[PDB]
Amino acid sequence: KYDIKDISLAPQGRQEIEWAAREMPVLKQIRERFAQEKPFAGIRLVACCHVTTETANLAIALHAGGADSLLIASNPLSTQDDVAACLVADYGIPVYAIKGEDNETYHRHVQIALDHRPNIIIDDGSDVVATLVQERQHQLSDIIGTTEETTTGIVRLRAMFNDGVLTFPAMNVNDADTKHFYDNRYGTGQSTLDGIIRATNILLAGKTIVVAGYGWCGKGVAMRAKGMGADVIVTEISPVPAIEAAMDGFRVMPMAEAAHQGDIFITVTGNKHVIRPEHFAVMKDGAIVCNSGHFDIEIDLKSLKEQAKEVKEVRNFTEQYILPNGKSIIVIGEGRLVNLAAATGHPSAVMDMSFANQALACEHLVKNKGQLEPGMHSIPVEVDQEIARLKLQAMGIAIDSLTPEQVEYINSWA
Amino acid sequence: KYDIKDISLAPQGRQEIEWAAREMPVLKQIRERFAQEKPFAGIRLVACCHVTTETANLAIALHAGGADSLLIASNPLSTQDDVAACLVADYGIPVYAIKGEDNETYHRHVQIALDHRPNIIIDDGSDVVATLVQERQHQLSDIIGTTEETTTGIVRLRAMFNDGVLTFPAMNVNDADTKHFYDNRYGTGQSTLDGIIRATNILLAGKTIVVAGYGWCGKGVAMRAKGMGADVIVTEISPVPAIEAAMDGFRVMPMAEAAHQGDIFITVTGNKHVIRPEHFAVMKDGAIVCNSGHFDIEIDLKSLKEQAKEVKEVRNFTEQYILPNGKSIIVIGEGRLVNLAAATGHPSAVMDMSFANQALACEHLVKNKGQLEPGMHSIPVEVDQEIARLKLQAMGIAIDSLTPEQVEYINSWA
Amino acid sequence: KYDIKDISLAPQGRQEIEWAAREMPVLKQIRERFAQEKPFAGIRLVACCHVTTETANLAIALHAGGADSLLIASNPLSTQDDVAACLVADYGIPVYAIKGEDNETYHRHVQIALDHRPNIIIDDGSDVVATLVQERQHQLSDIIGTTEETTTGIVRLRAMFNDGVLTFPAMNVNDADTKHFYDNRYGTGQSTLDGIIRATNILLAGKTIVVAGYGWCGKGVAMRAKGMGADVIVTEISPVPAIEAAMDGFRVMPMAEAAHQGDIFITVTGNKHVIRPEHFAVMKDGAIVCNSGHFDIEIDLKSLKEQAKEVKEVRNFTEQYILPNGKSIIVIGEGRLVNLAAATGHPSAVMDMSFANQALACEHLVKNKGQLEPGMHSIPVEVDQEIARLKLQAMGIAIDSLTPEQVEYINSWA
Amino acid sequence: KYDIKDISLAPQGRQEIEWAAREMPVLKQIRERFAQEKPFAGIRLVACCHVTTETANLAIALHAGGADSLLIASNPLSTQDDVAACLVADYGIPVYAIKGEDNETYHRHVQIALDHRPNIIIDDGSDVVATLVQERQHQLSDIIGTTEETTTGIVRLRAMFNDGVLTFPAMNVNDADTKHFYDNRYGTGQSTLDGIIRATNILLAGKTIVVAGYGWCGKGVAMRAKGMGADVIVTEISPVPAIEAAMDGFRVMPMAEAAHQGDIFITVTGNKHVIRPEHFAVMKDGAIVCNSGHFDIEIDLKSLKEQAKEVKEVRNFTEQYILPNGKSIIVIGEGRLVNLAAATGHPSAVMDMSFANQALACEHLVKNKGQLEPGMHSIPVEVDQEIARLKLQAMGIAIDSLTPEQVEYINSWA
Ligand SMILES: NC(=O)c1ccc[n+]([C@@H]2O[C@H](COP(=O)([O-])OP(=O)(O)OC[C@H]3O[C@@H](n4cnc5c(N)ncnc54)[C@H](O)[C@@H]3O)[C@@H](O)[C@H]2O)c1
Ligand SMILES: NC(=O)c1ccc[n+]([C@@H]2O[C@H](COP(=O)([O-])OP(=O)(O)OC[C@H]3O[C@@H](n4cnc5c(N)ncnc54)[C@H](O)[C@@H]3O)[C@@H](O)[C@H]2O)c1
Ligand SMILES: NC(=O)c1ccc[n+]([C@@H]2O[C@H](COP(=O)([O-])OP(=O)(O)OC[C@H]3O[C@@H](n4cnc5c(N)ncnc54)[C@H](O)[C@@H]3O)[C@@H](O)[C@H]2O)c1
Ligand SMILES: NC(=O)c1ccc[n+]([C@@H]2O[C@H](COP(=O)([O-])OP(=O)(O)OC[C@H]3O[C@@H](n4cnc5c(N)ncnc54)[C@H](O)[C@@H]3O)[C@@H](O)[C@H]2O)c1
Ligand SMILES: Nc1ncnc2c1ncn2[C@@H]1O[C@H](CO)[C@@H](O)[C@H]1O
Ligand SMILES: Nc1ncnc2c1ncn2[C@@H]1O[C@H](CO)[C@@H](O)[C@H]1O
Ligand SMILES: Nc1ncnc2c1ncn2[C@@H]1O[C@H](CO)[C@@H](O)[C@H]1O
Ligand SMILES: Nc1ncnc2c1ncn2[C@@H]1O[C@H](CO)[C@@H](O)[C@H]1O
Ligand SMILES: [Cl-]
Ligand SMILES: [Cl-]
Ligand SMILES: [Cl-]
Ligand SMILES: [Cl-]
Ligand SMILES: [Rb+]
Ligand SMILES: [Rb+]
Ligand SMILES: [Rb+]
Ligand SMILES: [Rb+]
Ligand SMILES: [Rb+]
Ligand SMILES: [Rb+]
To answer: Which PROSITE patterns match (chains A, B, C, D)?
Structure first.
C-alpha cells in the first residue's frame, strides 16, 4: 500500500517532476543505463529522503534499474504531496509521506519501511539505519549496504562505528566531492535564503544575519547573505573556520555576543542547542530564528515554548512567540530545515550530482556484495570524478587537458 | 461597491497587511499624524497601484487622513486577492481588482475609477492619468493634482508635458531620493530574483544572466545576480551607465551578442521590444526570459508566439515555447513584472519610503491647491530628507552631526 | 625658469609619461585636435595639480594647443620628480614642484604662478584661485576663467560665490558625470588601498576598516575594502548615504563608536577634524589612520602629536605615535592624500576622463570669452557625454542604440 | 662568510624586520619558547626561502633555538637586500642572496649551502633537496629531515618518493590547514594583485583577467580580482574546481578561447607551459602576462623571446615584447612570482602561520630523530590546530566551545 495526502495531485506532481529533470542530466544518463543493465534486479530498497521532485527523479532511476523500492519522508515538513501522489499513481512506488504528518505517523512509517525487509537503505540523517540496528538485529542478514546523504547522518554513523555496531557497509555520499562541495555550499546558500524570503518577504539588505557554523553549509549561507546585502556575523567552535570567516570579511564572535545584534539567526552546525534560552532573552524584539541543519534541535524550541506566554501563527511557516516581558521571537518552519520547510529545497542542478552519487553508491554496494568490509566507505574516486566530468559537460563548459610534456614534468623531480 | 475575487479572504488579508506593516514605521507615523490632522477631508482620490499588502498600508493611511478613496489594479497579475478583500470588508474602501482579470475587466475598472470624479489620482505607470486627459477633458476641473510611482510613468508624463496636455500638477514620486535609490535598486534587485526563483526553482549560481538596462533597477538586479553566483552581462544604450557596469565587473555588449550566451534574460529598460525575434532565434535551448520593467512590451512576446510551433504550461508562472527546430524558450509571468507576478513585489521595508513619498505628495498637493503651476513637480527636498531621517532612525542606525566649527570650515574659502 | 629636484631624471620621466599615456586615448585624441586648432594661442595658463604622469599628459595636451603654461604642485608629497624633470627638459614647460618641499617653498611657488599673470587657472583644491581673489584683485582683468578638479575645491568655490567674490567663470570639472562617477569612486577605491598597502604591506582581509564618508570616494573605498576581505564600517552625517551603506552590507555608526573597533581608518569627507583626540584615546593598540580627502585636516594630527609621548619613523610613509599608556597609533603619509603620498594616485584610465574634462573646459572658457556669467558653470552635457562615448569606444565595448520605433514609443503617452 | 649586495643596508633591514613582526605574534611566541628550550642546539640548518622580512623572522626564531643556519635565496628576484644585510650584520647568520643575481650565482649558492652539511633543510620548491639527493648521496647520513613550503615542492617530493629516492623524512608544511588555507589563498590573492599594480599602475576594474588554475592560489587571485572590479575568466584541467569557478560567478573556458579575451593573464597552476606561443599569437595588443606559481616555466617565455623581434624595459619590473606583426606582449617580473618580484610577497599576517608551521616542523624532526619513517609526513594535527588557536587569539577573535551535553550528543547515535 502507501500513505499519502491525495492521489489526485498526481498530474501536478508529474509536471513538477519533469520540470525538475531539466537540470538533472547526469542522473538521466544513469537512469538510461540502469534501464538497460538492471543492476537492482531482485533487490528491495528503502529510501528515507525528503520527498521532493529531485528525490522522485532518483526514485525513478532506481525503478528503471529494477529496484523494489519503498519511500518514506525524512522530515514531516519537507514532503511535496504532489510528488508523493505521482510516484504512487504513475510508477506504482509505495510512498509513506504526508506533508505535516505528526511524529506518531512518522515513526509508524519507519516501522512499515523496516517491514519491507530492505537489502539497501538510502538514508538522510540515519534515522532508519539507527532504528534497524537498535530494534531489528535479526534483519541484518538482509543488508547488502546502506548510504547516507547528509553530514549529520555521517556523524551518527561514526558514533555507531565507534560503538561497534556498524556491522555492514555504509556509503558516505555526503563527503563525495561532487556532493558537499556543491549541494552543502551553493545549494544551501541559495535555498536557505529562498525559504526565509518565502516565509517572511523580508528585505535582507541592511539586516544583521547571524550564521552559526562555518563549514560547507555555513560558507554558502554567509556568502549568499552577503551577496544579498546583509551584514553577516559568524559563530564557530573551531579556530580554522573562524579565521576563514574573518578573512572572508565577516564578523566572528561568540553566540552570546551575536544574540544582541542579529535580526535573523540561521543555524547550520549539526549540533544540539546552539541557540538557547539565555540567547532568546537578549535578542532584539522581533528577531527571526531558523535552522538549516538536518535536525531542528539546533534551536532550543522546547525551552522557548516553555518561556513564552503566547504563540500565534502570523503567516504561513511563521510563528510569533511572545515572552513574558512582551518581546517577540519569530520562528520559521518550526525550526525544521528552512529551505525545505518554507521553500522547495535545493535546486535540481546540485541534486543532480548528490543523487547521481546516491544511485552509483547503490550500484557499488550491489556490484561488490560480499567484498566490502563493514564500516564507512567513501565514494570511489573514479565515480566522484566521472560525475564531475559529466556535470561539467552538461553545463556546457569546456576546459583544458594536460599534454604529454606536462605529465612528464609532474613526474619529474631533478 | 467593489469588484473582488472573494470577500471571505478578508481575515487572511488582514493578517498579511499587519505583517507587512512591521517594516513600514515611517508610513505608520504619517498615518498617525493624518488621523489627527485630516488633510484629505472632503477629497476624493483614485489609486491605480499594485494591490499588495504595502499598497494596503498606504490606502489605510490616506483613509485615516479622511480621503474618499477608490483603488484599482495597475496590473492583472500583481493583485493579492486577500488584500483586496480586507480593504473592502474591514475599511469600506472600494477596490476594483481581481488577480488574473482580463483586459476588458481592467478597462472597465478604469472607467469606474474615473466616474469617482477624483480630485487626486495616485498612478503607477500613468495609465489612468492618460485616460483622464484623453477622454475626460470635462473632468479636469476636479483635479488638484496627480502623483506617479514609477519611471515609465514619469517618461509618459514628460511626453504629455511636451505635447501641451499636462495642464495640472503631477508629483514625481519615482525620482525622490528616498524612492528610486532604494525601491528601484535594492527592492527590485531582491524581488526580481525572488520571482524568478519562485517560478522556476532554478540555481542562479553558474548561470549567465543578461540584464537589459543599467539604471537604478538594472544596477540592483545585476548586483544581486552577481551576489547569487551568476555570470552577469549588461546591455545598454548610453555610455555612462555602460562604463559603470564594466567597472563593476560585468561584461557589456550588444543584445545581439548577449542573445547567444544568456541562460536567463531580465529586461529593466522601460523601453519597447528590447528582446526581439532575431534574438529568440539564436538563444540557447531552454533560455529563460522575463521582464521587470513596468510594461511587458519590453519582450516581443507577440513575435515569439508566431515563431513557436507549440506552447506548453510547464508549471505555475512558467510557459515553454517550442520552436520548429525543437529548442525551447521559457517565459515567466507572461512577460509581466516578474517580482510582482511570480512573487510578492518589493519587501515592505523599501515600500515604506516609496509610499511615505506618495502620502506626503498627496498632502503637498492639497495644501497647495490652486497654487501649483501645471507640469511636473519634484518631491520637496525637506520632505525627501525627512523620510530618510525617519527611516534611518527606524532602522536603529545612529550617525554623526557637524560641530559648529566644522560648519564654519565649510563656509570658509580663505 | 623652473624649480625642480633633478633635471637629470628627465629620461626616466619620459618613459613613465609614455607608459601612462597608453590608457589615456581620449586625452590623446584631444591633444591631436588641439595641435591642429590651437585654441590656446596667446593664452597664459597656470595649473596647480598633482605633478604626476597623468597631469603631464594633460600639460602636453594644453601645450599642443598653444598654451603658455606654468605648473606648480598641489601637494608636497604627490610630486613625481622625474615627471617634473621631463616637462621642463623635453617640453620647455616651467614647473615649480619638488617632492617633499616645505610650506614656504609651496607658498613661494604660488606667488611665482600668479606673477605669470594667467588668463586661465586649472586648480585642484582652489588654493591658487583663493589667493588670486584675496591678494591680486588688480589681476582679475586677466582672467578668462578657472577650473576646479576636486570636490573640496567646489565647496570652497561655492563659499566664494556666496561671499560675493566669485566674479569670473569657474568650471565645475569635479561634478561632470565622466569625472566623479569614475575618478572619485573607482579611482580612489583602488588607489587608496594601493597607498595603504605600499606604505604598510598589511593584510586587508580580516581587518575592520572604518570609512568616514559615503559619497563618491567613500563608496569606492568601501567597495574595494570589502572586495579585499575587510569588515567595513561607514560613518556619515547624512541619512540618504547612510541608508545606502547599510543596504550595501556595511555597518553604519557614529565615529565615537567606530573608534574602539577599527584597525584602519580612512577619511574621505572633505571636512575638518573627522578623527579627533577623543577617538585616538580609545583606539586599538596599533590602529592605522590615513586620509584620502584633499586636505590632511580631516585627521586632527595636531592633537595626536600632543597626546603622544613619542613619535618614531617605522618605515617609508609610516609614523608610529606612542601614547603614555604604551599603545600606538600609526599615521600614513602625514595625513596627506594616501593614494598620492604613498603610491602613484589614480590609474591613468580614469584620469583620462578627468583630464579630458579639464582640457575641454579650458577650451570652453576660451571660446566663450567675455560671454560667460560670473559664478560656477557645470560641464556642458554634450561635452560630458562625448567624453563617455569616446572612452567606452576606447575600452573596446559596443552597446545598443534605439530604433526609430523605440524612439517613437518614448514620446508616446497615449 | 656570506654573499650579499650591501652590508650598509642593515639598519633599514632591521627596521623592516621589526615592522613585519608586528603581525607575527605566533612565531614570536615560538621564538621565546625556543630561546628557553634550545631545541636546535648543535643542529646545522639550511633554509632556501624567499629572503624577506618574514623569512628573517623565521631565521631569528631558529637562531634563538640554537640552530647553526645558512640562508640562500629561493628566487633571484624575491630577495630583499636590506633583510640580507641585517641577518648578516646583526645576527651573524650567513646569507647568500643578492636581488637580481644570475643563474650561475644561484647555483653556486646551492653548492655552498650543501657544503654547510645541514642536518635540517627548509626548502621552498625543493631545489636544494633535489640537488642533495642527485649530487650528494654521501651526505644523506647528515639528514634528520627536511621541510617543504610550497605546493610545487610537494609535487616534486612525491615524484622523488615514487622514484624510490626519498630516503629521509620530509615535512609537508604547504598542506597544513594553517598554511595553504590562508597563505596560498588570501595571501596570494592580495599580494599577486599588489605586484601587478606596483609594476603597472593599471586600473583593474573593467579589465578581463584570466586566472589559470583554480586551486588554493587561483581561488584567492580570482576572488580578489573580482573584488577589484575585474571580469574574471578561469582555466582548468580538472572538472571539480572548474564547476566551483562557475558557481562562484566566473567564466570557465579553455586557454585557447581565453587567450583572445584577456587583458591580464595570471598563471597559478604549478605546471609547465600553460601559456604558449599559439596563445601569444592571438592575444590583444598590449596584453599583460605574469606568473604567481613557484617557477616561471608556467609561461613559455623562451618561445616568446624567440618569436619577438624586439624587447624593451618599459618600466620597473615590466618588459614589452614586440612581435613581428607589430603587436606587443607585456611581461611582468620576467615571469617570476609576481607578488615577490614586483612587490614584497604575502603580508606577514599569513606568513606568521606558514612559518610557525616551519619552525614547529623543524622541532618535530629533531624531537623525533630516529623515530620517523622515510617519506612525506603531514604536520601533526595537534600542531596545526594549536597554530590556529594561537592565531585566532592574537587576532582578537573569540568563539564558542562545546558543552558536555553537546559532546554527548555527537557521540550518540540512537
Ligand atoms: N538544509 C539542507 O539542505 C542541508 C544540506 C546539507 C547539509 N545539511 C546539514 O547542515 C549541517 C551542517 O553541515 P555541513 O556540511 O556544513 O557540516 P560541516 O562539518 O562542514 O560544518 C559544521 C561546522 O559547524 C561548526 N560548529 C559545530 N558546532 C557548533 C556550534 N555549537 N556553534 C558554532 N559552530 C559550530 C563546526 O566547527 C563546523 O565548522 C548538518 O546538520 C548537515 O546535515 C543541511
Ligand atoms: N518591477 C518593479 O518593481 C519596478 C520598480 C521600479 C521601477 N520599475 C521599472 O523598471 C524600469 C527601469 O526603471 P529605472 O528606474 O531603472 O530607469 P532608469 O531611467 O534609471 O534606467 C533605465 C536604463 O535602461 C537603459 N536602456 C533604455 N533602453 C534600453 C535598451 N533598449 N537596451 C538597453 N538599455 C536600455 C537606459 O539607458 C537607462 O540606463 C522602468 O520601466 C520602471 O518603471 C519596475
Ligand atoms: N584622493 C583622491 O585622489 C581624491 C579624489 C577625488 C576626491 N577627493 C576628495 O575626497 C573628498 C570626498 O569627495 P567626494 O567626491 O566623495 O564627496 P561627496 O560630497 O560626494 O561625499 C562626501 C561625503 O562625506 C560625508 N561627510 C561629510 N562630513 C562628514 C563627517 N564629519 N563624518 C562623516 N561623513 C561626513 C557627506 O555627507 C558626503 O556623503 C573631498 O575632499 C574630495 O576633494 C580625493
Ligand atoms: N606566489 C606565491 O606566493 C605562492 C604561494 C603559494 C603557492 N604558490 C604556488 O602556486 C602554484 C599553485 O598552488 P596551489 O596551492 O594553488 O595548488 P593547487 O594544487 O591547490 O591548485 C593548482 C590547480 O591548477 C590546476 N591546473 C593544473 N595544471 C593546469 C593547467 N595546465 N591549466 C589550468 N589549470 C591547471 C589544477 O587542476 C589545480 O586545481 C604552485 O606553483 C605553488 O607552489 C605560490
Ligand atoms: N531538493 C531537495 N530534494 C532532496 N533532498 C534535498 C533537497 N534539498 C536538500 N536536500 C538534502 O537534504 C539533506 C539534509 O537533510 C542535505 O544533505 C541535502 O542533500
Ligand atoms: N510590494 C509592492 N507593493 C506595491 N507596489 C510595488 C511593490 N513592489 C514594487 N512596487 C512598485 O511598482 C512600480 C512598478 O510598476 C515600482 O515603481 C514600485 O514602486
Ligand atoms: N594620478 C593622478 N594624477 C593627477 N591627479 C590625480 C591623480 N589621482 C588623483 N588625482 C586628482 O586629485 C584630486 C584630489 O586633490 C582628485 O579630484 C583627482 O581628480
Ligand atoms: N612574504 C613572503 N616571505 C616569504 N615567503 C613568502 C612570502 N610570500 C610568499 N611566500 C611563500 O613563497 C612560496 C612560493 O615559492 C609560497 O608557498 C609562500 O608560502
Ligand atoms: Cl555512469
Ligand atoms: Cl511626518
Ligand atoms: Cl574631441
Ligand atoms: Cl608552541
Ligand atoms: Rb519542486
Ligand atoms: Rb619538475
Ligand atoms: Rb505580501
Ligand atoms: Rb606614474
Ligand atoms: Rb617587507
Ligand atoms: Rb545524536
So the answer is: ADOHCYASE_1, ADOHCYASE_2
